[PDB]
Ligand binder design. Structure first.
Ligand code: HEM
Ligand code: HEM
Ligand SMILES: C[C@H](O)[C@H](O)[C@H]1CNc2nc(N)[nH]c(=O)c2N1
Ligand SMILES: C[C@H](O)[C@H](O)[C@H]1CNc2nc(N)[nH]c(=O)c2N1
Ligand SMILES: [N+]
Ligand SMILES: [N+]
Lengths: 408, 408
């Protein structure tokens, strides 16, 4: 029938009908999602996929180890024949995690795809044991502000009813509540989820930079709530380098961008819990987290303190404020020795990458909509670059929100 | 086989191969192009299409005129049966031109789709007669700076060998030459075409704001060259409202954005010559025409005059200059009483439109990549709006460059 369409600012959804009369930019397309299941992967699908992967892994060395490649193929088949899926070698998980990042069409930082730290936590079985690993991860990646790229891989899905997974969008992340004023405090984005932590007994601190708790589900079991040891969450306080009134704003952001809720797919296997992290590109904080109507929405407050024509849209005052907010974020990171890269530098880098990729392996999955920064479009190189967006393997899939499917 | 991919900044093209290994943002997709032909449209295709159109035209009144609708269907069939295509009534051309604009997924100004002036020049037969119409058009739309939206429709394609069409990208448009300095003067974009006007005896004035000649092809015949009466081309000189040194830059742009080279498709008919115009949205000039590496590339010159860290990319100096260049353009239009709308105002408007459209007829073809402005992305509403991009009818198609196919 029709097609549901979302505006993510207003939250308004519309149903398209006109398209049916057609001839001859969705955030979460089904195509980009790998959902739950109730039964192990069938063997007839699993095997071909595993073989494909093992042939990629071996076809990716400089000087081919044929015998080990033939052996591994044999051992993998026997394991599948014998157990009903198969485990990756560590020296295969590491490749899996790097190629999949390499294959994420929506990621600008892929120049760095080779430098990834991999934490093998496939032996995990309890919540407390997940939450320990998560803590280790955070501390490694954070490095006292010198951000290291890392990923923590938990036990692969088996039957689908013993799934490990984080209910958090990203590891470290601020809360948001629907205060009485008609207003909303903290991070509007996490409004719905904040409530859920409340439903599981998390004490609401009611502020605007409250780090939310990890909500961990292990081996299919109901999710237990863990608070993050505030010693690990490193934050950057926001000061402008001119407008001394900019600290009066009382702004800060967490330093670690660690996406928590995506699924890894490799050789037919699926890991619905594999949190990863790079570092921040300024605009992420300065433009989206700070300036989105859906988010912290500082744009008017900052403009007002600039003596700007705030009620005349043509004044271009948003263009002026946004830019200073970025300047602030950037400046606050460098000050405080927190790793960061500005979107301009980021765009030139990605470009080098892309060039590299095509000479390397003739292509680069790439989603224009996502790879162009939310300010300065035309001004970065990636805007003028035509690109194709395709899904390869291994790959990092979105997933249906855990509370929409989990049975407590 | 592979897939040619263009970067429009560098002009570099790459061939994608990786996509073949796929599982389960192009400027000129074939899908968006209607090309030449050597034979009249076959009747078996033409008729259904005509009927569809006539039923739309009649199904678009408030209070239905069934008898005239049944009559028109009859008269149209007889005409096709009898001549081998059919002519639209004027009160159908007007609807054709408005719906097609209404249906252009890449256009932000569609809120105004109803207000269009239509010049019926289907009776045209000579070049000189096209060039007269073009001149009338320019003068009407320009209105001494109070821009009126207009379109001039020429004779429909028949057999494909008597095509009317303009060889110009847009009516009024600056030239560009490959000067000896290793550099390039005027409008780099029109580098290839400028040469072609030279090949047809146009005297190169060698400047950086030289209006190019109309290159007109009528009834399939070789294109004759006409110079535009400088009295008709209204221009805006660029001054900033602070930086008095901004006029020292010696900048100006033409006031009329009139796209000249697209084809109208309606009820199976095709008009490969139907120039149209709205007015400018500032960023068009301030960001793309002025700041594209491929274009006039002022960004460094403007930054330097701002005492900006021009060799430190992270300085964010591009964000600062671009914004002032826009301020300048906007300010220069309002001064000089030239119609213009800023991209922020434009985005809020389009949004209203889109809302209107869905309540109206449940949909709105819409290409995100194009509808989001080249600066301030996140900051405009259209960024957060998920949208579907579909081709309806009537519709404005791109066309293969005339000199790639015409036989002299
Ligand atoms: C130099 C390090 C990195 C940089 C600068 C970087 C930058 C970014 C940015 C700016 C986004 C968009 C943010 C958003 O709108 O949500 C993104 C998304 C993404 N990145 Fe990277 N990233 C880095 C490391 C990584 C790593 C290590 C991985 C995986 C191993 C990765 C995979 C992804 C994926 C799957 C997305 C999509 C997120 C989503 O769909 O919401 N990136 N990256
Ligand atoms: C309020 C009046 C208008 C405004 C503000 C407006 C704005 C714009 C802008 C900013 C673009 C993109 C410019 C570019 O990147 O080349 C565009 C493209 C386009 N517009 Fe409009 N426009 C207006 C009137 C019209 C009219 C009257 C028509 C047709 C009757 C139209 C149809 C189109 C089409 C077909 C394109 C695609 C051009 C291309 O693909 O290169 N627009 N418009
Ligand atoms: C509707 C639309 O697709 C949506 O706002 C997209 C635009 N491009 C994006 N690009 C990135 N990096 N991150 C995003 O959240 C978005 N949001
Ligand atoms: C490669 C890419 O599609 C190209 O630069 C597009 C981006 N979006 C655009 N949007 C508009 N309005 N005009 C354009 O020329 C473009 N260029
Ligand atoms: N990130
Ligand atoms: N335009």
């Amino acid at each position: 029938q029709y097609v549901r369409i979302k505006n993510w600012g207003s939250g308004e959804i519309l149903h398209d009908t006109l398209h049916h009369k057609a001839t001859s930019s969705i955030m979460n397309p089904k195509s980009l999602t790998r959902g739950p299941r109730d039964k192990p992967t069938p063997l007839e699908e699993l095997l071909p996929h595993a073989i494909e992967f093992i042939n990629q892994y071996y076809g990716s060395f400089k000087e081919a180890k044929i015998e080990e490649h033939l052996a591994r193929l044999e051992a993998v088949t026997k394991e599948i024949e014998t157990t009903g899926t198969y485990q990756l070698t560590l020296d295969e998980l590491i490749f899996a995690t790097k190629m999949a990042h390499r294959n994420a069409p929506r990621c600008i930082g892929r120049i760095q795809w080779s430098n990834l730290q991999v934490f093998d936590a496939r032996n995990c079985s309890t919540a407390q044991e997940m939450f320990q690993h998560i803590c280790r991860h955070i501390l490694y990646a954070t490095n006292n502000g010198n951000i290291r790229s890392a990923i923590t891989v938990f036990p692969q899905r088996s039957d689908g009813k013993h799934d490990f997974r984080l209910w958090n969008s990203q590891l470290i992340r601020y809360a948001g509540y629907q205060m009485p004023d008609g207003t909303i405090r903290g991070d509007a984005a996490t409004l719905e989820f904040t409530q859920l932590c409340i439903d599981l007994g998390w004490k609401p601190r009611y502020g605007r930079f409250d780090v939310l708790p990890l909500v961990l589900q292990a081996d299919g079991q109901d999710p237990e709530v863990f608070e993050i040891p505030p010693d690990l969450v490193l934050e950057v306080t926001m000061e402008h380098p001119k407008y001394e009134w900019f600290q009066e704003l009382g702004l800060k952001w967490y330093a670690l961008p660690a996406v928590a809720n995506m699924l890894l797919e490799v050789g037919g296997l699926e890991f619905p819990a594999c949190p990863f992290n790079g570092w921040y590109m300024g605009t992420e904080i300065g433009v989206r987290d700070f300036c989105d109507t859906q988010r912290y929405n500082i744009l008017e407050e900052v403009g007002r303190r600039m003596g700007l024509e705030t009620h005349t849209l043509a004044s271009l005052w948003k263009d002026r404020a946004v830019t200073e907010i970025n300047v602030a974020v950037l400046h606050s990171f460098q000050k405080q020795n927190v790793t960061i890269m500005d979107h301009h530098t980021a765009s030139e880098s990605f470009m080098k990458h892309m060039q590299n990729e095509y000479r390397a392996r003739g292509g680069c999955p790439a989603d224009w909509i996502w790879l162009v920064p939310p300010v300065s479009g035309s001004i970065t190189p990636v805007f003028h670059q035509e690109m194709l967006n395709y899904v390869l393997s291994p790959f990092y899939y979105y997933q249906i929100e855990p509370w929409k499917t989990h049975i407590w």
